[PDB]
Ligand binder design. Structure first.
Ligand SMILES: CC(=O)N[C@@H]1[C@@H](O)[C@H](O[C@@H]2O[C@H](CO)[C@@H](O[C@@H]3O[C@H](CO)[C@@H](O)[C@H](O)[C@H]3NC(C)=O)[C@H](O)[C@H]2NC(C)=O)[C@@H](CO)O[C@H]1O
Lengths: 171, 171, 171, 171
């Protein structure tokens, strides 16, 4: 297996995820990381956030027909990172141009009129940091916002502002 | 001189901790980690676990007259690591012959008849990987139960038999 | 993909190896590889080398009471590789710290004053490429000399000199 | 349980040992003694031997990151006995199974080709009677050679040849 490490990720089974059915693999090492917000309900507790990860994947699978939840990872306001498709399966979160080359991470909540908690922001930079040590993320990765790659109000005005402060951020 | 990738930790200020007055330092890199429990109330949300961290620091400072919360780090059932004395300052968890040469991390609860949740064990484990990365812990660090070094039930029968299965455990 | 394409290993039965009794397992992909030497005599032909794998095993099972020969794999100077405990079973070749997290491979002979023949060094390097192909070793695994983790002269001055050269050597 | 001032053992401070960090205890009376050699360069003076004792500890502590030199006592060709981990701390000389139930004395030098001088042999035997008088060793203790418990050339051929004759040896 993988003795409980990296960025404290809540595994798929722990948030009661329907089994993935995706097979498109992503080209390690990855250059881009796109940050989006789900624009759904936000939660703060491990209990409420697992239920939300479940709810997001369910909308992507039962309704949109996708092979699994779109994002490679979801960040809850509880400060935990939720495993979506992982570092190896091409996501689906920023269109055909970016899905095969960037890793998508999504903040659960609407951040148009709100900001995620520091802990959520920590879990997120931390998550990327742990990407690098695995080979999934190339040490000198670039971070784009959803707006920057596709006409979307995502990840929200207030969260978008913060994303720009980040070091690895490109234009 | 390696200061990158590693874990997220709720910092002192975020859990509204009274300032530390401790000043004696540990010698890097530390060889031992001693795991304990607080035999106190458990908490399963970021807000409830901050209150709890606070109640532990409180009792150690206001009642036992220590310079700060006794432990170097505490773990919450919410899956987050709470900062205590940190990697560099000598804790006050395991007696006078062990405090000078070890990091003491304590799970917040009474583990005698319950096990902490996977997210807790996961956080505790990343934390240790981090200490190694930062160079605060020897690469071949050794994990010990509180009871292995002091006469006590800490960290509780259940959590005790769990940590015995840890890669770094050495009776 | 690229169908396996590795493995010219003389199996247990081919060298007559007493049945193994060991049951404890390694978890793949393994990260470390420890190179040792038998310090005993060498062999330079198939029945000759097959004779030693049997002696070496006899010494570990009969004289020390172990469940099987210590190494995961032995390297004869006939240029063949001999199945030891293999890729999945915990060896006994480099102490309680490294045995559970490494594959021990030992050159049959004593390389303090001499080197193993090119054939032998190829058999060894090729064996490792194989381990990676099978997912039994981390693509970025590390090669340590026995003396780098245990107090011994193993694997002999000259051979130690050679492995320090290997791509995956990390002292 | 009488005196005496048995054994003229050179204390750690006198050969300038680095502070030990070991804390695991041996339970007295210890039933076994394991004889090894350091397989290295030898010394025939109180001056060079104190130096060799230093080197050996340096290897175990700086290269191998151990809590102290591995043996409980070291015997020099100068006819003296250097304190290692002493009678009460569990050594790191012959593996997980024998370390907790034995005392490991080691002769400084390589004895595959030479026998150690009578005064080294005298130091060793007296060391052992001493352990019995203090009650650290059972009066009926058994002497095993290093190669009899772990795969190794240690204690070297000629010396292995000698300890096999000893009153307290046991197959
Ligand atoms: C994975 C997923 O389904 N995510 C959904 C979120 O993307 C969605 O946020 C809203 O997405 C829509 C686009 O699908 C954004 O709308 C577009 O905005 C542009 C201008 O920026 C406009 O020109 C488009 O016409 C408009 N299209 C639509 C349908 O509105 C919208 O601005 C995003 N709003 C926010 C707050 O992110 C949320 C909305 O609840 O649902 C997710 O499932």
């Amino acid at each position: 297996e993988d003795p409980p490490a990296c960025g404290s990720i809540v595994p798929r089974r722990e948030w009661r995820a329907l089994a993935s059915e995706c097979r498109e693999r992503l080209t390690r090492p990855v250059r881009y990381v796109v940050v989006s917000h789900t624009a759904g309900s936000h939660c703060d507790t491990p209990a409420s956030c697992a239920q939300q990860a479940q709810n997001v994947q369910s909308y992507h699978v039962r309704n949109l027909g996708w092979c699994d939840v779109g994002y490679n990872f979801l960040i809850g306001e509880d400060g935990l990172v939720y495993e979506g498709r992982g570092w190896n399966i091409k996501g689906a979160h920023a269109g055909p141009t970016w899905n095969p080359i960037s890793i998508g991470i999504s903040f659960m909540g609407n951040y148009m009129n709100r900001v995620p908690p520091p802990r959520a922001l920590r879990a997120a930079q931390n998550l990327l940091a742990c990407g690098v040590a695995l080979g999934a993320l190339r040490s000198n990765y670039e971070v784009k916002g959803h707006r920057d790659v596709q006409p979307t109000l995502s990840p929200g005005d207030r969260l978008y502002e913060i994303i720009q402060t980040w070091s690895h951020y490109r234009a």
